[PDB]
Assembly symmetry: D2
Homo-oligomer: 453 residues x 4
């Protein structure tokens, strides 16, 4: 009933399923009693109401997928597979569309083909998708004098007061959008978009028309010839038709992640899983060792990652390892270094040494974005490439596994600067400069060479 | 906002759709200008706004799955596969939960094992799920004097006036629930719920504890032995770990179906319109007016479609459906869904089949043994309608191509456990029917 | 030369063998210095010359197939596969032809389908073929007063003195015939004769025209339905197109077996000796002297081996065989082949099984229902020995691991069609036995 | 009973199977009434006796294999697969040993891996093995004053009179040796020797230790990376474990090839097949258009090839096409050019044009040996490579398919001259210089480059 230009969709009040068990609830309550940074400031009663809704909705992922990912990540940890993680820096509800989702899935796949060939081993494909709807902020008041935008799960991007109020109905809107995206993602990956031959064709079309193309023709051709070799040998080409794309996001809004907790079915044992995603990580600003995010990560069975910035000490890294991998399950923990290209060569070696000596097997993954940011906020492609380069140099020097990358990207032709010639044009992100389709593929070729190198 | 128990969606600055090929536009407007039975009566302007929202959401299904289905249904049409369709008579937002969905997916898969074994050919598995949120009514006002319940996509089940107001915001709720359900059925089918060995284990648990169990032990053991045979022969079994479950519902609310249209990139001779609210949809008895909106809408979409055929069907009208809906003679584009009562199917269906077979088109003949037979149905009349249906086809040499059944995973009933519709067979009776029909397929 | 109906092979400038690892040499000479029963009596010098020829020919089988077999037999030993061994009682050079070989391969495969279905687990298929050219005799002189026929590897079947002279040149003829037969069984099994669907079709033709057919229709149909189930589930079926048929014979003529030894490149802890005249060989009742050449020879080769156990077997001797021949406790290296008469198997076999099971070694228990029961055998006593054998294992909780049977593709019998041995079951009776044993496996 | 050093093995006289049918026999008799060049000169009665023996022995190959090869050759003819044919120039009974047979099968496989990768399409693998026991001679009396050696099927290599008498018992000895070799070949190819990963390892070991190695490191590495790509993608690696190696030889001794004729089983129709081999070809000296070899080829259903030398006219080639492919079955006929590297660029184009205009699809295959022969008879590697090079140049100029190679080789480290530095050392052939293991693999790398080229 609006003169508004807004439809109001009623949130159906549906009877609840039985509660989670008690031991697990006591554990959980004790974890969530810890202080949590960067939480939305909506009322408790509204929060509980919205949580209750989410407690009975169909999950975004199911436990047995997560168990599967855990096994695949174990191989990454042991130096036999490589982790590729990429997607929007922030999803918006506005752009949570087929074209945009297709675009990101295809950019990620395109990268995966090149990395799989370059690494010469399987690539675990993890999208920042289907829930990356919440972000920290350091500042309470933005350049316009407004409450900061904290992502669509918390408030709206529009530069006005009303949009910036923290509204917990966005938890439900968030769930609907994540669920819908994930449905699309499963559909696309199982019905042809993730066909290897098709994906590499896009790679050839890139090499043929990009101004940088010439640089990557040899490797592109070599991949092509790899592929044809497979037909030529008459392989059962079934596993070439589909690919698995896992969902991930920063676990930031605890009202959301706790509402999406589920207990798996007996057949070992039933465990607590966060079914909002397949894997989640904890950001720089919320990884307080005695805070609720880390404690939450302790209780869930999903694989998890922690972002490690320039202030990290090898001692604190070791504590993360002891809190988050208390059973020595290889690949249950990923430590994600993001330090800046100027710093990674010095800062990372001691951390790796100290963590390796623990006997635990973590995944070392490089986030070359969140360390290299300087009208618009932009990042230089060269400094991005160089951080991955240094990251590889650390591991090669130490005999450890450079296990993957974490990268912020899109399928759109946006405008980061320096792929081939680069901002006022197409700066579309609701956050950080998002390394357009062409740059992420270039990075993939450059990292492939670091792997053959 | 939360305070008001609503999610507020702004419509201005929503991603729009590109313009249709002039000609699809024209054809689609022409189809929808025709009269449409059983439509909700909410205001145009509110409907438009809701449609505009759905025009920008992720689809429930994608074109290439629907194209894959079409090929699988072509095998059925040709007498080389069998179609099993089943699920809730009506889904409700209140039961759109992980256990309820698991249960239905399980029940369906359990049927499919038994049917696959008894048919000796693949079974195309289509659930009534992720959209079966709208039903027709013969009366406007019900037994309590209220505006009839028409399914959660239109109004609410509660017995009060305000709950029965037609609410367009239910288009968007219906979408969210559908796509959430679809996400789950894809996850489950691809990650272990659809493992053949696990599914038959439940059949074995049913045979061993149902009071009917005895009756079906022999067949259940034979199936078990057939499965073990597969390991014994070392046949490579990724294909035994997953199954495909396609989504379907009655295409009833044209405001919903039209908003979920999308255009393919093309490839068999140009761009097509696909209804991406489902993989396949059918048109019911009360909306199949030959020059009505629903039939004409079915003509403009690429999806496979079916049409329910009741006791007053003539062979001539059946032929007209076939010529309108299968104008290119694509096997399996059209399913004729017979629902006639077990007392009538033996007499009424043969002439229809003969006339239609003489057109040279290859439809799927599917038996809906429910909608012809508290409101309850006798199991024996249901089984008997499928039995009569099988006799017709045996007599004529035609393919008895499938069944369409209304069921659940729940232990439903009579005052005991009656749960938004006509009476499902419960999970047990579904399985039992599957066993019974597998004997029809063997005999 | 042709004029003399001979092929002339020069021995000087023949490719020699490299020297054995000193230690295999020593062990092999020690084994062969032991006394050997049932050996041909031809001159040393002629034997040596023939051996020298065989030392340089292509092997009949290669080490890695024998290693593959060992792994498949380990599954049998563990109660997870079943061993079917069968073929001519004695091959003859005169029947070593494409139709006769096809027939036997067919009959064996036909049995294997039925057994695979009835066992509900893989069947390891081992033919008596490509070398079963030597037999023991209890008498030196036969009913006609002639030196007994001992198989075409030693002398001729014709009833005359010159034909019964032991002729060492038969070692080389035996090799040529064996390797020619093996070539054919590999070709046939890999190129369509071993297609599961084609093989069951013959079973279906048997059920439909044998006068016994009625008896086996139910099972044959169940199998057929099990097969169709496999297509129906879309399971990928290269594995349904081919089968492995392993070669075996009684290791009897030590001049032959020793000349066909070859040395592996190694890999489980050094180089081994493999008898490449076959994949697997067994030692008969009359040559299994515990401190004799044959047993000691079996100890020096890597192949899987079996030993025939007759009515006078003690549990203690059985244990000694097991400790000598399976000294490393490798499941499936050793097959104990029980052959006791149907009147005796129920009493004599349990104690043997118990004692041997208590050693913690895992042998394969195989039933040879022939050699314990014109010289003819009653089908009913044969079936009954396998039946008794199954009862023993059911009673003890042990695996009834397989059968060893003497058969053919030919329509043999009694004065009508008697064809170099004891009476085979003919092709029909083999199949019938397979059906009968598959019921034992199901029941 | 010898003071001789010879064992005499009796040839068992075994009852016969039913005869071939009559139509097919009349056809056959009329074919064999034609004159035949280069036949052994043993008596007719001895010949018939030995033929009768061979008529009932188990066949060397079976019809359904041959049908399969026909289909695979159809794809070669249509430009979608590549034919590799190689082995001993002449097999001997002496060397018909496991080591030697393993050696040749592995050399052929090693070639196939490189060619399969370079061609980017399947390679049909055809050995000169299991019957290549007979050769033509131009001269009646050799340099020693003896009747020429005509191969082990006909007489013996030893420089003495008695050995050189043509003895038809060698038909049976030939059959036994061919049968035994073929048995080995099936065993090896089905049980691990033909495993792709294993074979390429030998290729890497070659690249690492050959003095030419350095030349081929890039391609070798690129293949390796192709292979690892296959694991990395998780392909059903079953078709990587085994390979098909067909048997072939020159059909020269008609007493042999006719004795090995068999009629296939009904299920189209039963046909005459020569089961001494999978495919056979007719040499330069026996391809008289109205002779028995060509007529024999007409009656059998096997795929066949004809060698085409420098005297070939495009007209005569067309006649071969019309006699031997009268039903237009693609790949039933292979025309095998062997012209010399100095001549192939001029002589071959007109032949191809004239044959292409017939509408038939033959396979064009290059025999770069039998045209480049000059104490010992040797061939220069460079002239061998150059003929293949020219052969490719003809087809590239004409838009036709360069369909394969036919090459004489071995697994032995023999001494041809010029792989890396090359005769008195290891000249072991009973015929023409046989291009040792290392040279044939080098040729394979060089031809691979012609295919990517
Ligand atoms: N399914 C395999 C191979 C594959 C299919 N499509 C892909 C797309 C990109 C990379 C690899 C693939 C994998 O995921 O690795
Ligand atoms: N994938 C095959 C076999 C199969 C797997 N799981 C199943 C469950 C039910 C029936 C069949 C199956 C199919 O869906 O048909
Ligand atoms: N390859 C499987 C299945 C099979 C193929 N052909 C067969 C013939 C008989 C029995 C089984 C089979 C096996 O040999 O066991
Ligand atoms: N079987 C496939 C792949 C293969 C297996 N082993 C090989 C050896 C060489 C070349 C290819 C192969 C083929 O023959 O092509
Ligand atoms: Cl009221
Ligand atoms: Cl006498
Ligand atoms: Mn970011
Ligand atoms: Mn209904
Ligand atoms: Mn016997
Ligand atoms: Mn030559």
């Amino acid at each position: 009933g609006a003169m508004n230009w807004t439809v109001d969709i009623p949130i159906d009040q549906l009877p609840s399923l039985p509660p989670l068990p008690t031991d697990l609830r006591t554990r959980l309550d004790a974890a969530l009693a810890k202080p949590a940074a960067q939480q939305p400031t909506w009322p408790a009663d509204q929060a509980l109401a919205m949580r209750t809704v989410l407690e009975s909705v169909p999950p975004v992922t199911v436990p047995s997928e997560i168990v599967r990912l855990q096994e695949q990540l174990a191989q990454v940890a042991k130096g036999e597979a490589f982790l590729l993680q990429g997607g929007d820096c922030a999803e918006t509800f506005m752009d949570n569309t087929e074209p945009h989702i297709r675009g990101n899935v295809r950019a990620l796949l395109q990268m995966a083909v090149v990395l799989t060939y370059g690494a010469s081993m399987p690539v675990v494909k993890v999208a920042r998708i289907a829930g990356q709807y919440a972000k920290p902020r350091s500042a309470d008041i933005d350049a316009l004098g407004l409450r900061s935008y904290r992502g669509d799960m918390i408030n709206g991007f529009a530069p006005d007061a009303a949009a910036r109020e923290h509204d917990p109905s966005r938890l439900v809107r968030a769930y609907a959008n994540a669920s819908a995206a994930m449905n699309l993602v499963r559909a696309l990956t199982s019905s042809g978009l993730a066909s290897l031959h098709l994906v590499h064709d896009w790679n050839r079309e890139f090499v043929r028309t990009s101004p940088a193309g010439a640089r990557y023709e040899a490797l592109a051709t070599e991949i092509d010839r790899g592929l044809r070799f497979m037909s030529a040998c008459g392989v059962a080409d079934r596993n070439l038709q589909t690919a698995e794309i896992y969902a991930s996001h920063e676990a930031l809004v605890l009202d959301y992640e706790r509402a999406m907790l589920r207990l798996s079915d007996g057949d070992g044992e039933p465990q607590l899983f966060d079914l909002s995603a397949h894997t989640v990580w904890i950001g720089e600003r919320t990884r307080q060792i005695d805070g609720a995010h880390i404690a939450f990560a302790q209780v869930i069975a999903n694989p998890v990652g922690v972002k490690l910035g320039p202030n990290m000490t090898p001692e604190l890294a070791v504590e993360y390892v002891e809190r988050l991998d208390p059973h020595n399950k290889p690949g249950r923990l990923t430590l994600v270094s993001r330090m800046g290209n100027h710093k990674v060569r010095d800062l990372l070696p001691p951390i790796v040494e100290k963590v390796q000596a623990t006997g635990h097997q973590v995944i070392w993954q490089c986030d070359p974005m969140h360390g290299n940011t300087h009208g618009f906020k932009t990042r230089h492609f060269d400094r991005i490439v160089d951080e991955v380069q240094g990251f590889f140099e650390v591991h090669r020097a130490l005999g450890t596994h450079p296990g993957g990358i974490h990268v912020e990207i899109t399928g759109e032709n946006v405008t980061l600067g320096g792929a081939q010639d680069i901002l006022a044009g197409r700066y579309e992100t609701a956050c950080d400069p998002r390394l357009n389709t062409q740059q992420s593929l270039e990075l993939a070729f450059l990292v492939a060479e670091m792997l053959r190198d």
